[PDB]
């Protein structure tokens, strides 16, 4: 895969003057980058099924031994207390403000890229 | 259905715009929504405690009761604070009941 | 614009950010809005030649 | 107040208006299984028939079979949905099976809806795109529905009739109750004489009536004996029942 | 624009998780000692004992016990009391 | 002209055919490169500290079983049962 | 309650296996990815003044 | 149009990073477009200097931070000075910046 | 053999960048007297080769303890750092890493009646770093077990969904203790690894090599 | 001509072997009985016994025995002989 | 006859003619590890040098580094192999590392073999395609070998000399033994005056000699003091050793 | 991917008479089937390593318990007797005659395909 | 090397054309090659038996000896046909040896 500017330079050099201005949208699109198209689902990967069966195999096994733990009704009522905060965190955390607050932790996303200021790289 | 694609869209519109804070009115009684969540939280605990107890009610409690008895039991195996004692009384009660 | 490219990011099709908009955090400025429109005029390379 | 909160929850959250709001994602899944549980609900099925119309042109063949036999059981006939269904079938006719087409035709035979391009692409698919013993696995009450749908619409496909005539035998009619076998034998002989096609396996749908003629009238046995004499000179011989052994 | 490239590869585990799970399992099964509530006996005792008498009552607590301390099995009544 | 043999493997444009594979770090390629260039020269203080704890806690597990054996022999050499007979 | 474990060395070695996997995973998988996109941004933001001035002096286009 | 391939590859590659960095650019496309920047970044991680720009910020080295960034994009000018050196070699001369006093 | 592809600017990449750069900032490099140029660059690179990787170690212990502490707040799960050998086994391992670093600053030889009192207060750092993590994860979970037993005594005795102002005030006290446990889960993973940078950073000092010969003016 | 297409996909297991291995393992670990040479004891006995006395000599035979019957551990000398 | 069968097996199966018949598959693996074990064997290395010549144009960069430092340790110089090696380096110069090029050059510096296209593509790769602190990780006995290989061949690359001059400091020379530090300091100052390039880090290779002048002659210290006065007016000042503190 | 005969028919229809006979080798090769090219090795798959580590983990575990089996020297000398026949089977089985004998077990490979006899499908 | 590609090619040319039936001559003594394999087989067993015995020789045999003793042992623990007897004699012999 050669570079697309040498593909632009070649495709503009071997056109004529009459069909130059018509060819400029098919030389533009021949050198556009590939953004791969949204394929069909094929949902829940072979590892997303291990992650959900293995988490269900863990939650059932932990609730099995919680139910015979000599404080079994206190153990099973702590999962209600612990899952009550997972519900209150979905309803109280500002998830767009948290997303943009983690973007400021990283200096790569806290600013814009900064090089190559367009007046230095002209070709007139 | 597609098993990952139906109820993901059902849970999405149960999560987001399904709101019993406004569909059941409820701004008439509650000041903010930050205190509707702060007692839906405590409401989830009180409901979950009362479901976990009632789903198996005739049980001798592992936790210390404070000197209280549930209903008309008061001397049975359900209220007996000695556990090897109440195991004997439960096995007698189970033949009758 | 930047917030309009963030809205079509994979982050905002996630579940917790699905009904969110990136312009709600910091909106695009008037120069960023008028330069996204000016860049839309010049994606036709014939319009960019005749303007130049 | 425990009974009050449950009753308030039941009148605003679990109704059939939200049962059809979760049923908007995948329509022909929820359309098919609810109608099999006995949920007809004629104006809840109108919410189905418009939620699925931007999707009918890209459905799989088992989805199209699920739409038509659900909209048959709910008896609802949306003519501009059912032209998108027959344009799914007649555009993907090689992918449909005889198990699937015999259920789509019986929906299209109740709701008297046909095209000539649809009647060819169902007959091209049963004959050429499907296994030739797929009529044998069909059950003769579904094949007689296909035979009359081609005789109602006046469509003579003599290649399809030799295919559907495989699935008529003592085996396929013996699995029917004698109320349903009679409704099939009269329905199959009425279609076999409409085209004048008397295959060698017409002597099993005739012999399904003449071995037990006490369920038939003399008007219907005149219908049967009209086809028996019409098939006897076509096959070049005379009818004879067999006592087994 | 690249959003549909990242939806193609779905879930994936962290890039060495099979060495964490095989390291935590290999610490829980290569204990070098009997399996927490059991005791190694001779082969002459194991071949001579019923499987109801090899079981201890302490190792089979009741799955949702109505009285705290209920066990599911009862084990050997031949105690050395 | 400057003609693409000078830009080879130095500067490439955004891909048009397909998105390539990600370039692995040398540490993602082989554990031997990680172990010898980073894990042992830089993190051997941690691996020595994890080794000290597993060794020290094996001393304390050895002291705990030599104290269980001391109290066990001092009941079968003293005619008592060495535990509370289970409870059931 | 549960205070001492059945083996202290087994729990100390579970901590050393978990924390050495997190050390390996950070050093090998996370931190190469962190620094590939931290230092694309950082090298471009540190060179931007000297890159553009070196490029201004080079291209003959003015 | 003598050195327009190099000047327009720099333009088109940075414009695609800048449009997509921190939003949706994959790491495979960065390492495709700029393979020697990724190669030099990976040298710092391999040789235990993954915090070298934090080290130069701790010791206030603001001019060695600008040299650190400039020496890591140093290869962007290599397609030019390999071209201008092969001009001057086939024209008998010497390349200017290769020489100490020149 | 084929590595996965990473989107730039992902949220776990942005979080772990800020986390790593935080713990790296706790032991900053010291500015030399000289200006940093190509003369001083091998002395700066060698100054980094002799510093411990406390930026990497402290975010190893941050991320392995906050993941373990927050498991205790997931339903059906207990925190691994609520175990005595896990939590104190991380505390001794930080203390031994600091000591192995400080012992290697010489030639592995171990350093009147004062120095047994500097040693004791230094050897107690070993157990105090781990026991503070263990007792916090144990004492918060134990109090929650006792108060859930008390708050279950009222609906067991009284009616189910009856006499509800008695159990509401204790279900909101139970709910505010699980909320404090989310704060102690995040704080004790921070206090463990703030202190790991302090203990390991005590022996994180070497001689700047620097220029031994100069051409002045 | 198609020979190089079949060299690309390398080794691959039979197409459901994870259900055979998870079925044979689930028959060997869900036995419902103690683990072949061990006996379930009470928790009061397990917490009171050294790990050298929980071990039986029959369950630790010598890895390459110079005399047939050599065992690696010796177990509890408190026999009930 | 047990000793007879083993001795017969040893004289016909385990020899060095079959040791070089299993070594034909991957050459630069077996070439490198055997030569590190002390297996020079000049005419066993000729079997290597022709078995690898149809492969040198497609080797990885760590394979090319393994060929040259093996053929350096075995001291065998195949001139038509070593032009395929320098055509691997000068065609893939962006992929080579300074750790790899400083070992390839020291092979090419022993066997006095150079090209102008090779000397540019090694200098282009150390300066531009590699990290600028990669000389600092090098060890000054390898950098002085690179400095003289560019002064033997008369190749003035003033950008490469500013790069290699980073890797000369008190740190890099202090890791050398004083027999090897002296052989490096004289070898580095002889190359720094051949180009007349006196960087600011020449005051660490000069000061590595003037802090211990009792290992040097007066002829070599005249060589050192010739470079010190040549570097003093270039850097614009006077030399001064520092007593630490 | 449309069919290659309609690609042949289209590519031969829109050529001229002068360059017909020159174009016939590039219309031949545009409609040749793909035979994918021999890629680089990337040897020993993620499942060929499980198959060889899991077989080594089985052979070591079976030889471990064979060595303490009370007939341990008889057990370990039966693996020598059993592996002696695996060696004698590599040296005695005619592997080309066995390959062509299994090809005759299957009627699909015992003959050649038989339809479509070329005089029925001409287009003159 | 490439770890799967070197010695696969080495084993291939050890399997196929490396032949000690002809490289060691050996047609002078053997009639066919079908009987060179039929005693390389028995030769592999006799070598493998003699290696497995000799790699741990001082052992009391699990198998029944037929009334024979290896060397100058004859009354020691190596030849003792009672196994609890020979365990006692081996433990005495191990302190000395
Ligand atoms: Zn709990
Ligand atoms: Zn056997």
Coordinates of C-alpha atoms in Angstrom, one line a residue, chain K residues 8-9 12-13 18 21-23 25-26 29-30, chain M residues 1-2 5-7 9-10 13 18 23-25:
Chain K
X8 CA 30.9 -47.1 16.7
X9 CA 27.9 -44.9 17.1
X12 CA 29.6 -42.1 12.4
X13 CA 26.6 -40.2 14.0
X18 CA 26.3 -33.8 10.9
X21 CA 23.9 -30.7 8.6
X22 CA 21.3 -29.9 11.3
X23 CA 22.7 -26.3 11.3
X25 CA 17.9 -24.9 8.5
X26 CA 18.3 -21.6 10.5
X29 CA 20.7 -18.8 15.1
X30 CA 23.2 -21.7 15.1
Chain M
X1 CA 16.4 -20.9 15.2
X2 CA 12.6 -20.9 14.7
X5 CA 11.0 -25.1 11.9
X6 CA 14.6 -26.1 12.7
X7 CA 14.3 -29.5 14.3
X9 CA 13.7 -30.4 9.4
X10 CA 16.3 -32.1 11.5
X13 CA 16.3 -36.0 7.8
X18 CA 19.5 -41.2 8.1
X23 CA 25.3 -46.3 6.7
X24 CA 26.7 -48.8 9.2
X25 CA 26.9 -51.4 6.4

